[PDB]
C-alpha cells in the first residue's frame, strides 16, 4: 500500500530500531546478566553498547527457536503443558548439534 520513505534516514535503520522495540526481556536485567557473566571472565572488560544489543537480539531469537521447535513437535488434541523433557526431546528431534 502507501509507504513512507524518510528523506533523512534509510528504512533499513528504521527497521532495526523497530525490531529493538520488539524485544521481550527488560533491558536493565539483561545488561545486568551480561555483567554477571563478564565478572567471571575479567574485571576489566568493557562492552560496546551495540555489542549488548547484538547479544540481546540473538539471545531472544535463540530462546524463541527452542520454543518453536518444542511447539512443532507437540501434537495433541488437548493442549498440554510444556516440561523440560519436551524441550529436550524436541531439541533431539529437530534442534541443534
Amino acid at each position: 500500500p502507501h509507504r513512507y520513505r524518510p528523506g533523512t534516514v534509510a528504512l533499513r535503520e528504521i527497521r532495526r530500531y523497530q525490531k529493538s522495540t520488539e524485544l521481550l526481556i527488560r533491558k536493565l536485567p539483561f545488561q545486568r546478566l551480561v555483567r554477571e557473566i563478564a565478572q567471571d571472565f575479567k574485571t576489566d572488560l568493557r562492552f560496546q553498547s551495540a555489542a549488548i544489543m547484538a547479544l540481546q537480539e540473538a539471545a531472544e531469537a535463540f530462546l524463541v527457536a527452542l520454543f518453536e521447535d518444542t511447539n512443532l513437535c507437540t501434537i495433541h488434541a488437548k493442549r498440554v503443558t510444556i516440561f523440560p523433557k519436551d524441550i529436550q526431546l524436541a531439541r533431539r528431534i529437530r534442534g541443534e548439534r
Binding site: 509507504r3 530500531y17 523497530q18 545488561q31 553498547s49 547484538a54 511447539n71 523433557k85
Partner: protein, 205 residues
C-alpha cells in the same frame, strides 16, 4: 498531503535522534555501567522508542501506513489442502501481523475444524486431524524461515554493516582458530548439560 515545512522539521529531528543513537551505540560500558539504570544501553533504548513514535507521526502526516519493509510483513501463502476454505483459514491464521504470530497445533486444528463446520464440508475427525498435522508442519517451516530472514536482514548497526565472513581473523591465525575450536566443544557440552540438568530435575520430581 502534509505541511512540507513541518515534515522537513520532523525529518531533521529524526536525523538528530539517529545521530544520538549512533553515538550511544559506540559508548563502551564498564562493569559498573552495566549495573546502571541510566546506562547508555537504556538511554539508547528510550531514544529508539522516541524515534519510532516520531516515525509513526510522520507516517500519519504523509498519509502512509506504518510498514517499514520488514520480512515478517511478507505474506505466507498456504494452498496445501484440497479445500480452499480450509486453506483460507490457515493462511489467515499465519499472517496475523506482528512478532508474535506463531500458532500451535491446537490453533491450526481449530482453524481446520472451524472452516469445516462453517462450510459444512462434512469431514470426519481423523481426516481433519491429519489435515491439521500436515498443515501445521508446512506453516511451521515457513514461519521459522520468515523469522530467520527478518532477524538476519535486520541485525546490528553501522558498526557491523561491513561485516563479511571472509574477514574473520580466525581464518588466518591457527592459534586463534584452535582456541575457538576448543571453546566450541565446551559450548556444545554446556548447552547439552543445562538441557539435561532440567530434564533430570524433572525426573526427580
Amino acid at each position: 498531503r502534509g505541511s512540507r515545512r513541518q515534515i522537513q522539521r520532523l525529518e531533521q529531528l529524526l536525523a538528530l535522534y539517529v545521530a544520538e543513537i549512533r553515538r550511544l551505540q559506540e559508548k563502551e560500558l564498564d562493569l559498573s555501567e552495566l549495573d546502571d539504570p541510566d546506562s547508555a544501553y537504556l538511554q539508547e533504548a528510550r531514544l529508539k522508542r522516541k524515534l519510532i513514535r516520531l516515525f509513526g507521526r510522520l507516517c500519519e502526516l504523509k498519509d502512509c501506513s506504518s510498514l517499514t519493509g520488514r520480512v515478517i510483513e511478507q505474506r505466507i501463502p498456504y494452498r496445501g489442502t484440497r479445500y480452499p476454505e480450509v486453506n483460507r483459514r490457515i493462511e489467515r491464521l499465519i499472517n496475523k501481523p506482528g512478532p508474535d504470530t506463531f500458532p500451535d497445533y491446537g490453533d491450526v486444528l481449530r482453524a481446520v475444524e472451524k472452516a469445516a463446520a462453517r462450510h459444512s464440508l462434512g469431514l470426519p475427525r481423523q481426516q481433519l486431524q491429519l489435515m491439521a498435522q500436515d498443515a501445521f508442519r508446512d506453516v511451521g517451516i515457513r514461519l521459522q524461515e520468515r523469522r530467520h530472514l527478518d532477524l538476519i536482514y535486520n541485525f546490528g548497526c553501522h558498526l557491523t554493516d561491513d561485516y563479511r565472513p571472509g574477514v574473520d581473523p580466525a581464518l588466518s591465525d591457527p592459534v586463534l582458530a584452535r582456541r575457538l575450536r576448543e571453546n566450541r566443544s565446551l559450548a556444545m557440552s554446556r548447552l547439552d548439560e543445562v538441557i539435561s540438568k532440567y530434564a533430570m530435575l524433572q525426573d526427580k520430581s
